[PDB]
Paper text:
The active site of DPP11 lays in a wide cleft running through the middle of the protein between the catalytic and helical domains, which contributes to the formation of the substrate binding subsites.
A notable difference between the unbound PeDPP11 and its complexes with peptides is the conformational change bringing the helical and catalytic domains closer. Analysis of PeDPP11:RD using Naccess32 revealed a large loss of solvent-accessible area upon peptide binding, approximately 1430 Å2. However, our crystal structures of DPP11 in complex with LDVW and dipeptide RD are both in closed conformation, excluding the possibility that solvent released from the protein’s cleft would explain the larger increase in entropy upon substrate binding.
Author numbering:
A (entry chain A): 21 to 723
B (entry chain B): 21 to 410, 414 to 718
The structure:
Amino acid sequence: MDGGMWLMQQINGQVARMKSLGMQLEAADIYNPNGSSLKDAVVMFDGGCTGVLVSNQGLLLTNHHCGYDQIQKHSSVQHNYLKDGFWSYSLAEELVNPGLEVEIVDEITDVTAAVKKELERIKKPSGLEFLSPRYLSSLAPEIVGKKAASRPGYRYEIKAFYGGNRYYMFTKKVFRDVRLVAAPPSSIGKFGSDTDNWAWPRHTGDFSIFRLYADKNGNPAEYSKDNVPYRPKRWVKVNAQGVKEGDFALIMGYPGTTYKFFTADEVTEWSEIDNNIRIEMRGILQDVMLREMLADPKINIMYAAKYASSQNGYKRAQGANWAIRRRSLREIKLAQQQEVLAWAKQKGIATTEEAVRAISKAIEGRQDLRMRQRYLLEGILMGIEMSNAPAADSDIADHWDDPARREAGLQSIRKQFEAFFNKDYSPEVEKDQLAIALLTRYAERIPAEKQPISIREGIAEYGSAKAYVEMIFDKSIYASRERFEEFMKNPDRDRLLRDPMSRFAASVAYEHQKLAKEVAAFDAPLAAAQRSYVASVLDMKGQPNLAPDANLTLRFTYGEIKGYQPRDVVTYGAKSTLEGVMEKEDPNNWEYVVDPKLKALYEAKNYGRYANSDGSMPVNFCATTHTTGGNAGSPVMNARGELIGLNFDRNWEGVGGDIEYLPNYQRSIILDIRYLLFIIDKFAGCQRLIDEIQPQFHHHHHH
Amino acid sequence: MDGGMWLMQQINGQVARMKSLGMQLEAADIYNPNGSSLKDAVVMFDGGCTGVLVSNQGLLLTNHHCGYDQIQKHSSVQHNYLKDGFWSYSLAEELVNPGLEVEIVDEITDVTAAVKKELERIKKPSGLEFLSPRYLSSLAPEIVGKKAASRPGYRYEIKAFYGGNRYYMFTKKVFRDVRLVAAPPSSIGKFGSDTDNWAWPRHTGDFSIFRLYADKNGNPAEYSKDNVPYRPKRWVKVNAQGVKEGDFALIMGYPGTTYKFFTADEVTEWSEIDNNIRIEMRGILQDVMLREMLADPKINIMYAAKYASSQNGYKRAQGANWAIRRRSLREIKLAQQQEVLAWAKQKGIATTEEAVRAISKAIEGRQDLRMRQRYLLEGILMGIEMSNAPSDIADHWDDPARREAGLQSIRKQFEAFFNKDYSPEVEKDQLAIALLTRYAERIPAEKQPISIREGIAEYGSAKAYVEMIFDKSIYASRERFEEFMKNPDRDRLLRDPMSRFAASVAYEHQKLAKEVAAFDAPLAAAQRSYVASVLDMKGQPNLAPDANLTLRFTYGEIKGYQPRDVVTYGAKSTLEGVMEKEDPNNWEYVVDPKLKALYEAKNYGRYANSDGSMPVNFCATTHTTGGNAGSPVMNARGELIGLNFDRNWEGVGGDIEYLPNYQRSIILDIRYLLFIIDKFAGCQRLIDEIQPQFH
Ligand SMILES: N[C@@H](CC(=O)O)C(=O)O
Ligand SMILES: N[C@@H](CC(=O)O)C(=O)O
Ligand code: NA
C-alpha cells in the first residue's frame, strides 16, 4: 500500500514496516550476503523476465509470455505447442533451448568509488557514458581482475543507480542449459490476450515451466547430453492453502525501467513523443499482422512472438498516456520537483534549479531529433524486416579480383541472408501490406529532406511508398530464396552493390546512426542535469529511505492482496475465478476461445484440492505491490516466504506506476499458484510435476 | 424485484407486499376509480413516452430523449437547441409544438364482455382484428354512446390484454397544446449517448420540461394565443433529500411491449429474424449517417433525431439477443411452457398442447414471409427516404379541374417528401446504395419489389440503378422540381423512376401483409388459447399481462448488482463519473465547461449527497421497458425522487423474462435535474414553480 522497488541492501530499513504488515520473515531470510536466502531462488530469465526455483532439481516457474519465445521456436503446424501447449513426462522429454540463459545473483557490491575513478581517467569523454550499461560492465575486468574474464560460468554486471550517483556490481551465475518442461495451451496462458492485457479483472493462466541443468559437479554449463538437473542452494516452497484480501505479499524480481525522478517537462515529452509515436506506428503494424495471422496457421506461428511483443508495448503506451491524463501525473511530478527546489532554496543550494532548467532546455532542444528517432525506430527498424537485408562489404574494393577475399565476401552475404530470411520471416506478409502501410505513414510524418536517402529518392522516382516497395521486391536478389540461390550460382559485382533492398537497409542504418550522433549534444547535458537533480533528491531524502529507479537488477516490493475502485460506481474485488473464464467464452472470438477440457472440468467442478473455501476455482488475484516490466514471472510469497503466486501484469491504472505510485490505483496482477497446480494436475495430468513441486496443503504434520 | 407490469386495477392485490417493502401509501393513493390519485399526474407523452405533472400550473417532466423530436424541430445552426439546450424565462417564451399531444387517463373500465360479444357476427373475419388497437377502439362508440365519445377533448382507447382474453377501456383527456419549457444541452441530456446507451454505470442528465396549456375554463384545447396553463387535479411533489440503497421505489408509466408468454420457438424466431435483421441493416445505415452528420453541422441537425432513434433500437436488439444467448432464455421459456403443459395434462385439458403446436407451426410457415417483411421494413421503408416519393394520367389529365387538382396534391406530396430534415445529397454517395446493395445481396431478385427487380438487371448494379433514379427523375432536387413544374407533362409523371420505386416498395409491403395473414391469424388465435390456459392456471389477479402501451405500475428497491466475476456496481452514480469520462475529442463524452466549473467549485447547494458528492443517476429493481421513458419514480410516500430513462444491459432481456439479480431500471436522480435547472441554467422561475422539499 506504499510503493518503491527496494534494493536488496535496503532490506534492513524496510523489515520493521514489513513485519508490522504481518511479515514473519527475518531480513537475512530475504537477502543474506553471508549465506543462503530467498535471493538464491529468484532468477533472471532470458535477459528481461524473472523466474523462481521451486524444487531441489532446479524446476523453474515463470510466465507463459516469458517462455513464449522458446515455445514459439519449438512450434510447427504439425507440433503446435503455442496452440496445444507442451507437457514432458520425464527428464529426457524436456526440450533444449539453445541461446537461452538464466542468471542468479551470487554477490552484490558497491563499486561507486571504483567506477568513478574509472569514469574520470577518460580524455574527451563521450557526451556521457556514465550511464551506458555496455561501457560500465566493460569496467569489470579492471575492478575484479582475472576472476571475471576467466571464470566460465560467471558474469559481472555494473549498473548506474540514482542517475549515476551510485554504482552497484552484481556477480552472476549464468546457466546456458535451460530446458522447457511444460506450457499450457495459449487459450489458457494468454486467455483474452489483447483485450484483457493490462487489465484487471484478469482470468489468465500465465505460466510456463523450465528446468536448470548443470554439469557433473553441479556447476552451470553449456548444453550437454550428459548434463543433469541443477540442485539449487535454496528453492521456494509452494503453499497451496489459499489467499485472502488483506494478506501480506512479498515480491522479488528484476524490474526493468521506471521514471520516478521525471520533471514535468520530461513527463510531457515522453507522452507526446515516445508514447504517441509508438501507439501510432504499432497500430498500423498490428492491424496488418493480426489479419495475416488469423488467416494462416503457419504465419500465426511465425509472427506470434513478434506480434505479442508489439501489441504489449502498444497497449502499455496507451495505458501510460491515459494514466497521465486521468491521474494528473504531470501535475504530481511538478509538485514534487517544487518540493525539492524549495528544500534546496531553504538550504542555500543553487545547483538544483540549474539542473531542472538544464533538463527543460535539453528536452525542448532535442524535439525534432527525438521525434525522428522514434518514427524511424517504430516505423522501420522494428516493423520492416528489410532493415536487416544483407549488404556488400569487401566486395567491390579491397578484393573483388582476389579469389580468397571475394569468396569471404560472398560468404558474408550468404550468412546475413540466412539471418534476414529466417524461419519467422515471410516475404508475402512483408511485401503485400505491412512494409507499405508503415512506410506510407512514415513518409507523411517525416519531411522528405529528413528521410533516409534511399527512401526519399525512391519515393521521388517511383510514384509512392507503395510503388517503391513493389520495385524493391521486383528487382532485389533477396526477394526470395529461389532468386537468391539462382543469382549466387553466377554472382555479379554490380547488381550486388546496387541492390535496392540492400540500399534500403543501408540508408536506414545510416540515418539511425546519424540521428544518434546528433542527438548526443542534447542527451548528454540532459543526463548530467538528471544526475545533479537526483543528487539533490538524495540529499533531501536519505539514500537508505530512497528506492532508486528500476534498472533490470534484483529488487523487492511488498504490500497486500487487495482489489480497488477503478471509477465511479465500480468496485473490483481482489480475487478472480474460473467462472470468470466461462463468462468470457466466445468460440468466434480468437482471444476468448476456451479449451473443451477446461470447460468440462468447470462443469463437473472437478477442482480437487485447489478450490477456494466457497467452492469456486481460483484463477488470479491482485496486490498493492509495486512492479513493472521485467517483474513478469516474479515469485509472490506469503508472510512466511512460501510461494502463493506468480506475478505477470499490472492493472490499467497501474501502468502509471512507472512515474508515480498511487496506492488506490496501483496493482500487480498475479497468477494464483492453485490455478497453476490445477492446470498441471486436472487439466494436463502431468502428475510428476505435482510430485516434484510438493505443494503444501495443510494436513497436520507427522514427525 | 419480483417483476411484472401491473394493471392499475391490480393495485389491491399488490399493496400488502409493497407495504412489506416499506411503502407507506394506500392503494387508493395510487389508483382511485372514484376520486383523485397519482394516476391523474402520470401522463402519456407523444404517444410513446411517459411524463409527470409536477406543479399546480401544469409543468411536465419527461426525458430529454422523449423531447428530442421537438428539440430537433425547433433547432437550427443559429438557435441550436440540440447542442446548446434551451431555457425559457417566462410563459411567453415557451415554444409551441404543433402535433404534439399528451394524454391523461381519466377512467379505466372492464369492457371484456361487451367487446367479445361485438367481435361476433364479423362475417368472414381476417383473423387479426381482436388484437387491433384501431379496430377495437373503433368499437368504442357503440359501447359508450355517441355523445360521450364525440366530446372534443376526449379519446377512447380499447386494447387487448392477455393475448386477447381481456379488454379494458381507457378514457383519455387529450392535450393538443403542449409547449417546450426547457432542455439541457445534449452533452448533458445524452452524455455518452451511443456507448453508454443501455448501460449501467450511467451519468446522463436525461430530462426535458414541457407545460400543458388549456382554455379560459381550464379544459384541454387546441393551440391558441389566448391559452393559459392547465391546473391539474393532482401533481406530484418533488423530494430532494436524496436516496440510498434499499429504498422503496414506485414507478408508473406506459410500458409498450413485452413478451412474457412467448413459447420457446417464438424466442428463437424473434431472435434470428427481427433482431438479427434489425441489427445488420441498422448497422450499415448508422455507419453512413454518423459520418455525414459529423462532417457537416447542418446535416448533423437535420438527421439528429433519426440517427438517435435508429441507434437506440439497434443496440436494444444487440442487448436482447445477448440476453437470449447468455441467460438461455429459450430454455427458460421452454421450462415454463412445459409446466403449463403438464398442468393441462393433469387436468385433462387438450387445449394447451394444440396451442403450443399451432404456435410452432405458424412460426414455421411464416419464415421467409416474415423474414422478408423485416428486410423491407428495416432496409428500405425506414432507411431509404425516397420510399415516400410522390385523377392526374388517366381519369382527367385533359380536364383543367382534376388535372388542376392532381399535381398540386403531388406538391403537398412532394413537400412532405423533400422536407426540412431531408437531404438528397445524403442518399446518393453511400446511404441509399449501401442499404440496397445488402438488401439485394440477401433477397433473391425473384422476391424483390417489381421496381427493384427491373434495374440491377438492366443497369450493372443497385449503385447504378440508384444513380439512374436521380439522374432521370423530377423529384431529385427542389430546383429541378420547380423548373419542370410550370411544364407538367403527363407521360414522365407515372414513368418517374423514383415514383416507380415508392409504388413497388409500398406494393410489395401490402402483399406481404396480405400473405402473412394466413400465418399470423392462426398464431394469434393459438397464443390467445395458450395464455387462456396460463390464466386458468395462475390467478388473473396475480398474473400481470404483457405491456401494450397502457398505464401500468411497477415497484422495487434502489439497488446495484454484480454483472460478472470480480465486479460490483453500486446503485448510485455521481458527477465525478462524468468528469472521469470527459474527452474533448470524442463527441459523445464532451463536457460543458460550465458543468465542469460547477464540479471544480463543488457548487452543489442542497442538491449534493450527504457525503458531499453530486448525484447524477441511480438504478432500481423495478420492471420497465420501452415506453417507460419519462416515468415518475416515487418514494415510499409517493414523492418524486427520479425520472426513469433506461435499462441496464442485462435488463433488456427483461421483455422476455424478468431476472431479479440483473434487471435494473436506470433513473435520473431528481436532484441532478434540479441542479441543472438551478446551478447550470439559472432558471430560477422553474425551481420556484416546482418546489422541492428538503425537510
Ligand atoms: N508484463 C510485464 C510486467 C509488468 O509490466 O508489470 C512483464 O513482462 O514483465
Ligand atoms: N429508454 C426506453 C426505456 C426502456 O426501454 O427501458 C424508453 O425510451 O422508454
Ligand atoms: Na542539484
